[PDB]
Amino acid sequence: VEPARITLTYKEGAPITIMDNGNIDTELLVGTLTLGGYKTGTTSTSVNFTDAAGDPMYLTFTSQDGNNHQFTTKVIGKDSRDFDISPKVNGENLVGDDVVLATGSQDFFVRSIGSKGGKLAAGKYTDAVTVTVSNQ
């Protein structure tokens, strides 16, 4: 019988710098997630990235200096014919229809949106993210 192996590799993106007004740029590639091991046929709706903030469709990053500076990110990817697709993030998809994941592995891009409260401060921001895959 066939094991259910799941792997993830996270590659960090370029350094982020706050600009002169206090915003980070939007659409910045925070980093790249490669999901692997799943059996061909596994679909985008069967992958759910969750975090403690639990904001539907976004992963929330929080400062570690006790001022609760936050920004959000989306998680998105491309299918074989270049449609934007996305896994569930806190239970909901931001873009695309449900699709079969690419054979072998699928890359997803973690991309900055913005801060709803705004002015960010320099320092370290973190998130702890669970990736649930529901195997067929």
Partner: protein
Amino acid sequence: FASKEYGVTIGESRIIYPLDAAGVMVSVKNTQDYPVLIQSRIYDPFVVTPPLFRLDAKQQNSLRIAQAGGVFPRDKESLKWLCVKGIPKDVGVFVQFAINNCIKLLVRPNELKGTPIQFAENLSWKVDGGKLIAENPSPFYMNIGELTFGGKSIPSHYIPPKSTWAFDLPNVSWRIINDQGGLDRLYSKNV
């Protein structure tokens, strides 16, 4: 650019749980170079033992899944999920991940004649309300692993026992996944 690796392997991709059996065993491997806590949950008529335990780098252990209570239907299969989680000017971003690897726990009466692949061909199809609808007259989940319509790939889903499921629209072709987790033969029908 620094990378971080994560991985959890379950020794099978589905559990067929004979209704009223004492229990079954499932192996978990931590395929990584650091220790993890393995956190196992079912989505309490089943218990997973141990629900949380330390699994050292590169090690494998076994979970016991045991029916401890729960009444369930005697003419049809039932479905639960076993989920196994491995818990490991500048704006510095630090993210940690954890994989939660989920598989089907199919509760199956012993009495039911045959297995799923004997009934794979019995799926019937209609188009309605902008949707492609499969009907499953068997007592088993038909866990479709590959599905096409008009020759275009459709993201698959199981069809529940004695029931239906509805697919968005993109001749029907499908393969179910069998009890050993392999892809089964291709069937094809006009709607």
